[PDB]
């Protein structure tokens, strides 16, 4: 069995190692969706509007587009304005991540809950974000949930 035992473990090692290859690949995935969710929500939860213009200018691409069921905008300026209007209408409100973001390719899906300034859970949404060939956000699509 001597030769068979050495060979038997080399075969086993080959499988286990490639599954570590595939498995670590899965880790970078779920973290990538969390980073995008945090950056997107960080912009929506940021109380100071100036930092948000700076953030979007840096993080977002110049050719970027957003659309949801009530409103739409494209570009850093347009999105910055939308963000400014939303925070001005709901001062103190916050967007908190819900569940674990997931996705595939340049698409990320995640859900979030809208938390009132006093901490009540009043609703939630879901968004899909796309990155451009330069690592900058080029597309965001939001949805409503019941």
């Amino acid at each position: 069995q001597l030769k068979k035992k050495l060979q038997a473990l080399k075969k086993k090692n080959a499988q286990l190692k490639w599954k570590l290859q595939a498995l670590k690949k899965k880790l970078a995935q779920a973290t990538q969706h969390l980073t995008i969710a945090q950056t997107y929500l960080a912009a929506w939860n940021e109380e100071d509007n100036e930092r948000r213009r700076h953030l979007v200018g840096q993080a977002w691409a110049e050719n970027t587009r957003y659309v949801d069921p009530l409103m739409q905008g494209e570009g850093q300026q347009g999105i910055a304005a939308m963000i400014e209007a939303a925070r001005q209408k709901f001062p103190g409100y916050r967007f908190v991540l819900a569940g674990t973001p997931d996705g595939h390719g340049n698409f990320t899906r995640f859900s979030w809950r809208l938390i009132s300034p006093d901490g009540d859970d009043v609703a939630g949404g879901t968004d899909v974000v796309s990155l451009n060939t330069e690592g900058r956000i080029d597309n965001v699509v939001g949805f409503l949930d019941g």
Binding site: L2, K5, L6, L9, K10, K12, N13, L16, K17, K19, L20, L23, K24, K26, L27, A30, T100
Partner: protein
């Protein structure tokens, strides 16, 4: 024909060393070629009925020195089966061929009074060839014992590394 039979077998012996030496390392090959050289000298003395000087006593002490060296590495020597590996199998064959030649040469010394050193040389020669097979079994196997533990440890480590990452995702 004790002379013809004895010298014929000695030819067979040195021929078998010529084959085994292509299956061993440089160190073992060098030793085997020196022994093959020695067998050539032994055949000269026996073949000439004493007319030609035989081997020196230093060739016998040389074997004894090598026997002591390898003897120190083998603990268990009483219950081993011949041919653990292809390489060791070649040496075990030579040992048995040496044994009939040893007997045949003993007869020549008995009836001609020549080959005293050759007889003792062949006796020690078979002993050394045995140890070399066992050493090869140790060299081929102990180094393989290293590779055995290596893949056994790597596997275990990869198991732990995976169990961590799976439950560390769904957090």
């Amino acid at each position: 024909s004790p002379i013809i039979e004895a010298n014929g077998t000695l030819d067979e012996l040195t021929s078998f060393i010529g084959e085994a030496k292509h299956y061993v390392d440089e160190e073992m090959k060098g030793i085997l070629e020196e022994i093959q050289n020695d067998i050539y000298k032994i055949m000269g003395e026996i073949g000439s009925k004493g007319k030609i000087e035989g081997i020196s006593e230093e060739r016998i002490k040389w074997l004894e020195g090598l026997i002591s060296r390898y003897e120190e590495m083998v603990n268990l020597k009483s219950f081993v089966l011949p041919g653990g590996t292809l390489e060791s199998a070649k040496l075990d064959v030579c040992r048995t061929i040496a044994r009939r030649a040893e007997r045949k040469v003993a007869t020549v010394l008995r009836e001609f009074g020549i080959g005293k050193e050759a007889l003792v040389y062949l006796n020690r020669l078979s002993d050394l060839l045995f140890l070399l097979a066992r050493v090869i079994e140790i060299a081929a196997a102990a180094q393989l014992e290293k590779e055995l533990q290596a893949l056994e440890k790597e596997n275990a480590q990869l198991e732990w590394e995976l169990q961590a990452l799976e439950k560390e995702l769904a957090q």
